[PDB]
Design an enzyme around this catalytic site. Structure first.
Site, PDB file in Angstrom:
ATOM      1  CG  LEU A  25      39.098 -77.511 -38.638  1.00 48.93           C
ATOM      2  CD1 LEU A  25      39.498 -78.249 -39.922  1.00 48.93           C
ATOM      3  CD2 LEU A  25      37.567 -77.617 -38.549  1.00 48.93           C
ATOM      4  CD  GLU A  32      39.237 -83.839 -44.327  1.00 45.67           C
ATOM      5  OE1 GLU A  32      38.754 -82.858 -43.802  1.00 45.67           O
ATOM      6  OE2 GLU A  32      38.740 -84.968 -44.238  1.00 45.67           O
TER       7      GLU A  32
HETATM    8  N1  LIG Z   1      38.801 -82.990 -36.483  1.00 43.33           N
HETATM    9  C1  LIG Z   1      37.511 -83.359 -36.640  1.00 43.33           C
HETATM   10  O1  LIG Z   1      37.055 -84.139 -37.453  1.00 43.33           O
HETATM   11  C2  LIG Z   1      36.593 -82.709 -35.646  1.00 43.33           C
HETATM   12  C3  LIG Z   1      35.094 -83.040 -35.700  1.00 43.33           C
HETATM   13  C4  LIG Z   1      34.336 -82.298 -34.632  1.00 43.33           C
HETATM   14  C5  LIG Z   1      34.920 -81.483 -33.769  1.00 43.33           C
HETATM   15  N2  LIG Z   1      36.307 -81.263 -33.818  1.00 43.33           N
HETATM   16  C6  LIG Z   1      36.826 -80.282 -32.757  1.00 43.33           C
HETATM   17  O2  LIG Z   1      36.482 -80.831 -31.436  1.00 43.33           O
HETATM   18  C7  LIG Z   1      36.210 -79.629 -30.583  1.00 43.33           C
HETATM   19  C8  LIG Z   1      34.745 -79.773 -30.101  1.00 43.33           C
HETATM   20  O3  LIG Z   1      34.842 -80.956 -29.311  1.00 43.33           O
HETATM   21  P1  LIG Z   1      34.359 -81.091 -27.777  1.00 43.33           P
HETATM   22  O4  LIG Z   1      34.674 -82.344 -27.202  1.00 43.33           O
HETATM   23  O5  LIG Z   1      34.934 -79.964 -27.048  1.00 43.33           O
HETATM   24  O6  LIG Z   1      32.792 -80.905 -27.837  1.00 43.33           O
HETATM   25  P2  LIG Z   1      31.499 -81.430 -28.485  1.00 43.33           P
HETATM   26  O7  LIG Z   1      31.236 -82.876 -28.434  1.00 43.33           O
HETATM   27  O8  LIG Z   1      31.281 -80.813 -29.865  1.00 43.33           O
HETATM   28  O9  LIG Z   1      30.418 -80.491 -27.609  1.00 43.33           O
HETATM   29  C9  LIG Z   1      30.365 -80.764 -26.149  1.00 43.33           C
HETATM   30  C10 LIG Z   1      28.917 -80.377 -25.788  1.00 43.33           C
HETATM   31  O10 LIG Z   1      28.130 -81.095 -26.406  1.00 43.33           O
HETATM   32  C11 LIG Z   1      27.055 -81.678 -25.653  1.00 43.33           C
HETATM   33  N3  LIG Z   1      27.131 -83.125 -25.559  1.00 43.33           N
HETATM   34  C12 LIG Z   1      28.125 -83.876 -26.120  1.00 43.33           C
HETATM   35  N4  LIG Z   1      27.982 -85.158 -25.909  1.00 43.33           N
HETATM   36  C13 LIG Z   1      26.758 -85.116 -25.118  1.00 43.33           C
HETATM   37  C14 LIG Z   1      25.909 -86.246 -24.439  1.00 43.33           C
HETATM   38  N5  LIG Z   1      26.402 -87.496 -24.618  1.00 43.33           N
HETATM   39  N6  LIG Z   1      24.853 -85.878 -23.813  1.00 43.33           N
HETATM   40  C15 LIG Z   1      24.542 -84.582 -23.764  1.00 43.33           C
HETATM   41  N7  LIG Z   1      25.191 -83.549 -24.265  1.00 43.33           N
HETATM   42  C16 LIG Z   1      26.302 -83.905 -24.927  1.00 43.33           C
HETATM   43  C17 LIG Z   1      27.221 -81.013 -24.265  1.00 43.33           C
HETATM   44  O11 LIG Z   1      26.544 -79.832 -24.384  1.00 43.33           O
HETATM   45  P3  LIG Z   1      25.977 -78.786 -23.128  1.00 43.33           P
HETATM   46  O12 LIG Z   1      27.216 -78.344 -22.437  1.00 43.33           O
HETATM   47  O13 LIG Z   1      25.125 -77.919 -23.933  1.00 43.33           O
HETATM   48  O14 LIG Z   1      25.249 -79.782 -22.235  1.00 43.33           O
HETATM   49  C18 LIG Z   1      28.755 -80.893 -24.244  1.00 43.33           C
HETATM   50  O15 LIG Z   1      29.337 -79.648 -23.647  1.00 43.33           O
HETATM   51  C19 LIG Z   1      36.532 -78.343 -31.428  1.00 43.33           C
HETATM   52  O16 LIG Z   1      37.947 -78.049 -31.350  1.00 43.33           O
HETATM   53  C20 LIG Z   1      36.224 -78.882 -32.856  1.00 43.33           C
HETATM   54  O17 LIG Z   1      36.924 -78.145 -33.796  1.00 43.33           O
HETATM   55  C21 LIG Z   1      37.159 -81.881 -34.756  1.00 43.33           C
HETATM   56  N1  LIG Z   2      36.745 -85.519 -42.384  1.00 43.99           N
HETATM   57  C1  LIG Z   2      36.326 -84.573 -41.613  1.00 43.99           C
HETATM   58  N2  LIG Z   2      36.859 -83.344 -41.764  1.00 43.99           N
HETATM   59  C2  LIG Z   2      36.425 -82.355 -41.018  1.00 43.99           C
HETATM   60  O1  LIG Z   2      36.992 -81.193 -41.187  1.00 43.99           O
HETATM   61  C3  LIG Z   2      35.388 -82.524 -40.005  1.00 43.99           C
HETATM   62  N3  LIG Z   2      34.949 -81.483 -39.263  1.00 43.99           N
HETATM   63  C4  LIG Z   2      34.005 -81.734 -38.390  1.00 43.99           C
HETATM   64  C5  LIG Z   2      33.543 -80.565 -37.527  1.00 43.99           C
HETATM   65  N4  LIG Z   2      33.940 -79.235 -37.941  1.00 43.99           N
HETATM   66  C6  LIG Z   2      33.443 -78.647 -39.092  1.00 43.99           C
HETATM   67  C7  LIG Z   2      33.915 -77.376 -39.475  1.00 43.99           C
HETATM   68  C8  LIG Z   2      33.491 -76.719 -40.613  1.00 43.99           C
HETATM   69  C9  LIG Z   2      32.584 -77.294 -41.481  1.00 43.99           C
HETATM   70  C10 LIG Z   2      32.095 -76.638 -42.725  1.00 43.99           C
HETATM   71  O2  LIG Z   2      32.090 -75.387 -42.855  1.00 43.99           O
HETATM   72  N5  LIG Z   2      31.622 -77.444 -43.696  1.00 43.99           N
HETATM   73  C11 LIG Z   2      30.944 -77.065 -44.939  1.00 43.99           C
HETATM   74  C12 LIG Z   2      31.928 -76.936 -46.117  1.00 43.99           C
HETATM   75  C13 LIG Z   2      32.451 -75.500 -46.146  1.00 43.99           C
HETATM   76  C14 LIG Z   2      33.098 -75.310 -47.464  1.00 43.99           C
HETATM   77  O3  LIG Z   2      32.443 -75.216 -48.620  1.00 43.99           O
HETATM   78  O4  LIG Z   2      34.379 -75.319 -47.739  1.00 43.99           O
HETATM   79  C15 LIG Z   2      29.835 -78.041 -45.312  1.00 43.99           C
HETATM   80  O5  LIG Z   2      28.823 -77.504 -45.859  1.00 43.99           O
HETATM   81  O6  LIG Z   2      30.085 -79.238 -45.062  1.00 43.99           O
HETATM   82  C16 LIG Z   2      32.113 -78.550 -41.121  1.00 43.99           C
HETATM   83  C17 LIG Z   2      32.519 -79.206 -39.965  1.00 43.99           C
HETATM   84  C18 LIG Z   2      33.510 -83.009 -38.265  1.00 43.99           C
HETATM   85  N6  LIG Z   2      33.888 -84.063 -38.992  1.00 43.99           N
HETATM   86  C19 LIG Z   2      34.875 -83.801 -39.857  1.00 43.99           C
HETATM   87  N7  LIG Z   2      35.360 -84.763 -40.669  1.00 43.99           N
END
Ligand SMILES: NC(=O)c1ccc[n+]([C@@H]2O[C@H](COP(=O)([O-])OP(=O)(O)OC[C@H]3O[C@@H](n4cnc5c(N)ncnc54)[C@H](OP(=O)(O)O)[C@@H]3O)[C@@H](O)[C@H]2O)c1
Ligand SMILES: Nc1nc(=O)c2nc(CNc3ccc(C(=O)N[C@@H](CCC(=O)O)C(=O)O)cc3)cnc2[nH]1
Length: 206
Positions: A25, A32
């Site tokens: 992230l 948050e």
């Molecule tokens: N800002 C937020 O709230 C938030 C929440 C989550 C993540 N993020 C960010 O998003 C990034 C991760 O995202 P991403 O798109 O790269 O990956 P992702 O969805 O976490 O992981 C992709 C892997 O997941 C598996 N997968 C996902 N959908 C699948 C399906 N429909 N069927 C089978 N396997 C599936 C596959 O695994 P295999 O390759 O093992 O087949 C694919 O390589 C990171 O930067 C993370 O920090 C942000």
């Molecule tokens: N609203 C929202 N914010 C996010 O940061 C978020 N992150 C993800 C995926 N990434 C992450 C990254 C870190 C942790 C994590 O360490 N969570 C702990 C809290 C750690 C702490 O105490 O500060 C947990 O137990 O939820 C969770 C999800 C998915 N949905 C989200 N949704």
């Protein structure tokens, strides 16, 4: 059988739908991430006794969690991988797809189980978000809007807050957001570390 319950998606994104950078992230938001933990952990008082929530995530997202915070405590964790060599867990599941995970849970957490399922959360990443946006049971988005055009390399796949999706996705009143999460939540803009963000709840009719 396969999917009884509704799915809820939880995400934190910029006004540009940016969600991550370099498998992480792009922001450090303590209040948050605390909100993430509350929402995803929250089960009503009465149902408190047997019930637990589930967090469904993509493997890259599993990888992106600090070794320290993983698996995510107090919640049933499931990783979606089309390629499971293994899984480094001790009561953490793996599933081939979103539906495969729902069947796994409904089979794993049936009548023979002490542990019952309350709410199911899809926590990402973009790939998983895309499959969930297409799932006939996803009807709710817990979104945190970050008002800062932070450089990101991964984007939320559907522009749900945009004019084109406005007859399907509706933003709900703050009071029913609070009612859904249980606790009252900060209204309006929150400033934490140079960033301005706000909590929203969006729903759609199935
Ligand atoms: N800002 C937020 O709230 C938030 C929440 C989550 C993540 N993020 C960010 O998003 C990034 C991760 O995202 P991403 O798109 O790269 O990956 P992702 O969805 O976490 O992981 C992709 C892997 O997941 C598996 N997968 C996902 N959908 C699948 C399906 N429909 N069927 C089978 N396997 C599936 C596959 O695994 P295999 O390759 O093992 O087949 C694919 O390589 C990171 O930067 C993370 O920090 C942000
Ligand atoms: N609203 C929202 N914010 C996010 O940061 C978020 N992150 C993800 C995926 N990434 C992450 C990254 C870190 C942790 C994590 O360490 N969570 C702990 C809290 C750690 C702490 O105490 O500060 C947990 O137990 O939820 C969770 C999800 C998915 N949905 C989200 N949704």
């Amino acid at each position: 059988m396969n999917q009884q319950k509704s799915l809820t998606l939880i995400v934190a994104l910029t006004t540009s739908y940016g969600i991550g950078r370099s498998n992480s992230l792009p922001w450090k938001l303590k209040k948050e991430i605390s909100y993430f933990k509350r929402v995803t952990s929250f089960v009503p008082t009465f149902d408190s006794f047997e019930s637990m929530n589930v967090v469904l995530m993509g493997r890259k997202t599993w990888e992106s969690i600090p070794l320290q915070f993983r698996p995510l405590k107090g919640r049933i964790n499931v990783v979606i991988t089309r390629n499971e060599s293994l899984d480094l867990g001790n009561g953490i599941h793996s599933a081939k797809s979103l539906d495969h995970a729902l069947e796994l849970l409904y089979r794993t957490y049936g009548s023979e189980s002490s542990v019952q399922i309350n709410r199911i959360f899809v926590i990402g990443g973009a790939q998983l978000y895309k499959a969930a946006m297409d799932h006939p049971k996803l009807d709710r988005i817990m979104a945190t809007i970050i008002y800062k055009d932070i450089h990101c390399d991964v984007f939320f796949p559907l522009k749900f807050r945009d004019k084109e999706w406005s007859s399907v996705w509706k933003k709900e009143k703050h009071s029913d957001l609070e009612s859904w999460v249980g606790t009252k939540v900060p209204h309006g803009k929150i400033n934490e570390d140079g960033f301005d963000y706000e909590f929203e709840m969006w729903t759609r009719d199935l």
